[PDB]
Design a protein around this ligand. Structure first.
Ligand SMILES: [Co+2]
Ligand SMILES: [Co+2]
Ligand SMILES: [Co+2]
Ligand SMILES: [Co+2]
Ligand SMILES: [Mg+2]
Ligand SMILES: [Mg+2]
Ligand SMILES: [Mg+2]
Ligand SMILES: [Mg+2]
Lengths: 386, 386, 386, 386
């Protein structure tokens, strides 16, 4: 069972299943993958659609004639299979010109170029019907201190995004932006390192309602952070416009393991949160089938992403629906957490003797939280041992 | 040389040099330090002021009698020595009643007590002249996934902070709140884990202008983040209300080494940023003299904090004054970073062929950023090897 | 179901379920637990035996008499319950006298004292039947560079262990030592930080055959290391004399979560390894029920330790016994890995054209490893989604 | 000033300054560098010699003739400049054939091919005068648990290294191997992740005396460890056959910053140890000038490696020669650390009352270690203050 279907809204980037397997210490182990192939092979697995960077669909340096040809092939493949394109993004990290950044490159010409390159693909995104546009500034950062004044770099970043919002507004476009944070790699330190930082930045943009976050499992885990907590904060602020699902095993280089791999329990809690919140965005995977795999392994790995999600979905549902679990929830006063602290006004609080003078701290401290029993119920469910 | 004076505005929390040496695997190695002894000794080292947790000054459960008697001896030492109290904070983490949190404890009765305990210290802070009130939610968090629903926790956290802001207002108090982020410890994962999460949170509060952040070197470093970068984003938004300086040697338990120890270069870039930005806040130290040290070792450590800051301040300044460094900065285009990307507007950028069609990417890609020579000049300055 | 029994050989440290919950930020949340009470409670859960630090059974400083009165109760509870004492260890980290270390303390008198203390609990260890004596150098280390010359510290450390081995040999004792590695905490950096340094260190002791390692899941993970891999190297060397099972959520302070919690998959591969290797050592738990828990939570947490190990044992055995998995294993060539590289020798290899000249590198490079399908089968087994 | 000279014995890998700037998310930003140019440029900067991967000097695919040619050119550049080649290593990680490992690849054919490739370069090494042969199993490891049975891997690894040892011995060659540890990258987990693991492995090899370790700064720091401490154990065991100097800014992907960068103070303690231990090995640099740098940045970065080492060398020497520091050392009892714990022997220790019953443990605990004053004097020297 656990067979995924387009109704599950699973999506993959063409750069994922399309990863040739090139790493810092080794060359490609797989041949390039024709976007049409990736479209057809994914639809067959039950995927809902695909996402792409501009350079994944249209080769860099392509002519206006060649560009039109590449999109036609991709279009015909999307129409025949019924696959959609919910999200689009720009590649502002691969080319040598972006070695010092894109929107925050010290050189002004590079920055202007970055914007124009992004704008052209935003138009293409709209045509393909993409409603979300991700921006991952992997080259926005530094390796040394004096090399980048962060404040000036942030001003440039705000200016870049404001211009981007102004553009979609003047064109009457129906597309929002999703900023994807990353603590490091490819840069020593990357600006807007976590979901928290991206969220904060968005608040100082001219039109904030147009920007959200595109958190990625591996990225936040590269800072040893709790992913579902991060995501919880993004939902709390209504800023979760898109998400990247994968696996990461600890603080180290981005491994982009298939969703489910890496921190299993963190993947379980994530699914729990997304389902319980009713999040409606596509479940997009940004992973890289290990370079040890051949083309058949790539498809196995991609199928694994969706499978693990559905498995966790089921287990998380059973956990929350379990009468004994719900009972354990009340025992850990999770219900009181959802109750306002002082809906009786600040004045009533200051006069409430039960809130200070008559509060029996010792009695309160002696009461166990009962989290461990609760957690083992979650473990039994995850492992199917109940 | 490098003798500190009140003019430098150095402040130490009473719990720093007052730490008895108790850690997870050992008992105290030093006797409790009398707050009066702390004030006197610090003033002798050149300190400017001291900070405190309500429980650092007044024992828990103490009666109003013993209460006023403690603040009496304190005020008496500050007046005689000339030390001031710039900041005051609450201790909502030691008492077992706060084992599951304070503002976000699942038990409602505990959350209300947390607000009353804080409020009572907010009055003492104002009575003592302190205009900055720090809030470190060390117990706000969880060890397990279902033990806490972050969205719900954040709602209770917003409520608590709103009520606190409402209180200072109704009282016409001239005080501001500074939220102290932290990724983990003592809780498995702490809410508002980094400077960014704290920033994003405040913007969702009822009166944002009343809250800021109090980042600590060790905290951001426990998530392997670039403290200077995060500090810059705080300043960028003008939310750096307070700061805790100390040392950390990588991702591990919070070490609270004296400032300068741990990541030395990061400390250097921090001073560089704070001084070049003209931040007028006091340089507060929140460290812990190793339990291996006796009372004299404590004062030596405290002196080390200030000494290292003054030494770095001198080196950072000479770095920025050196005409050779200035030239190296221009060679790396740090000046263009400050210049607007598109001062003339969106429609101008779109129609600018130099920003796309006729932009020689390869020519711009061949330009070295000259960051390495720039950074080695910084190294020579820090090391006094110019 | 999954009810554990004494046959499973599960053991717990008295300090585990007996932890009062006192972290470096808060006071204890639970009263002290009587050792006798621990044996009885653990016996009912299905535990096989218990372990202890000298200070967990005898008040520090007790005389010949009181010391004896204490061993009588415990032992009386052992015979009555049928619980055993497979291992004992020394507490050379709590008393403020070991703030700079025990065997590697700079003060000679402290080092000598450390040996006498350890040696006296070795006689007790044997008196109680424990044939394994663990050694965890928690205070062996430093926070600063000149505070500890590691070469001298190792000379001292080696002498201590050599003396201990000479002593057990002179007494004709049938006991072995298990050195327990740790990266940091309570010291900034701890000597012999991982399983490898301990194994290497042991090879320079006078009687290497007498010492082994007692790795802990949490400790190794504090260095972002693969615990199952480390155990594999210990097993390969025949040096896995004991083991500490628990959970850890990434690089940070020692959490000591219950076994199964933290990195779930690492836990799984670890049980897979120990079971497939046929390791006959006791499955010992060194964890700490979160301080948020009451006495009921303590037992719930201890129960989870064994439960989780039992579930994983069944899932790992099912995985290995699955015909489809054995198929994927061959497809991935795990069988060839176990085959010798050059059975016929070096000269035959130098003369073998298939090893160089006529070696079709590309054909071999295009060969898929099929690790993903293998790993997803492992994931379905673990989640009971087969 | 701090001008390097061949007398300092500084060496560089050809792949270092020769790094084209390619990373997981970007193309090269610098053209291929002729090995002749590197040698000429380095000799001009004050370098003493260079090291290389077989494939750095002789491109893969080359014939005996082309190979003969490449070597000839290299040799004459070496004779002209006077540069030497102290160490040689094999590239067993770039070609897709090694995606699953070399000596421990699952496929036997790959394993044999790997050894022939190594053996062939070992001969070239002896010809070039290389006395040390480094080995970095960057591909020896895995991303999933069932993909690799570590024990079997270690068996193949032992078998491979024993075969190499049998070859050097039978050939009468004068060369020893140096195993390079690395926690991860490019593999999820790499076998022999640290100095400790590598040292433990060597002891089980047939001819241990022929193998030592080649520890790298970044590598150990990618596991959050203290490199100087690891070096101290390597030197303690007399197994430091080579070393890779560079910088790393915390737990993250391998940065290979120039030596001095990253953890500055750890670099200081590193030089202090190497200098005081009197290690006569060459100070080899394995770094990568940032891709943001052009050809000129490359040389400026490489000169920075030597420069920083010489600066730290001088500061550490001063620190140790400083009478005030020698006093501080005595006060922190570093002298007693070097004194045998029990020279009077075991039995005399057992009968010594002052070592146990008559030991004033309280009086000892209160004796401060005076580590902080000692470290600040170390800080002051490093920073050129005093
Ligand atoms: Co990624
Ligand atoms: Co701290
Ligand atoms: Co532990
Ligand atoms: Co490296
Ligand atoms: Mg992504
Ligand atoms: Mg603080
Ligand atoms: Mg342990
Ligand atoms: Mg290296």
């Amino acid at each position: 069972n656990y067979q995924p279907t387009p109704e599950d809204r699973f999506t993959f980037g063409l750069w994922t299943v399309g990863w040739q397997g090139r790493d810092p210490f080794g060359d490609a182990t797989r041949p390039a993958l024709d976007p049409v192939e990736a479209v057809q092979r994914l639809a067959e697995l039950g995927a809902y659609g695909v996402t792409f960077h501009d350079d994944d669909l249209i080769p860099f340096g392509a002519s206006d004639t060649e560009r039109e040809a590449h999109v036609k092939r991709f279009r015909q493949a999307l129409d025949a299979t019924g696959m959609t394109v919910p999200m689009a993004t720009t590649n502002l990290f691969t080319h040598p010109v972006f070695k010092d950044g894109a929107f925050t490159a010290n050189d002004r010409d590079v920055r202007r170029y970055a914007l124009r390159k992004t704008i052209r693909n935003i138009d293409l995104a709209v045509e393909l019907g993409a409603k979300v546009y991700v921006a991952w500034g992997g080259r926005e950062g530094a390796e040394s201190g004096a090399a980048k004044d962060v404040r000036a770099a942030l001003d440039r970043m705000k200016e870049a995004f404001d211009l981007l919002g102004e553009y979609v507004t003047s064109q009457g476009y129906d597309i929002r932006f999703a900023i994807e944070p990353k603590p490091n790699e490819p840069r020593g330190d990357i600006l807007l390192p976590t979901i928290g930082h991206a969220l904060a930045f968005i608040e100082r943009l001219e039109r904030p309602e147009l920007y959200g976050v595109n958190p990625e499992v591996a990225h936040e885990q590269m800072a040893g952070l709790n992913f579902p907590h991060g995501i919880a904060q993004a939902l709390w602020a209504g800023k979760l416009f898109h998400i990247d699902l994968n696996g990461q095993s600890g603080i180290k280089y981005d491994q982009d393991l298939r969703f489910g791999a890496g921190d299993l329990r963190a993947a379980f809690w994530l699914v729990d949160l997304l389902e319980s919140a009713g999040w409606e965005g596509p479940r997009h995977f940004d992973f890289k089938p290990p370079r040890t795999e051949d083309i058949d392994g790539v498809w196995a790995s991609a199928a694994g992403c969706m499978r693990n999600y559905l498995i966790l979905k089921e287990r998380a549902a059973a956990f929350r629906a379990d009468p004994e679990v719900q009972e354990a929830l009340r025992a850990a006063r999770l219900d009181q957490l959802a109750e306002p602290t002082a809906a009786d006004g600040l004045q009533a609080l200051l006069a409430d003797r039960t809130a200070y003078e008559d509060f029996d701290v010792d009695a309160a401290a002696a009461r166990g939280m009962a989290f461990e029993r609760l957690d083992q119920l979650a473990m039994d469910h995850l492992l199917g041992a109940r």
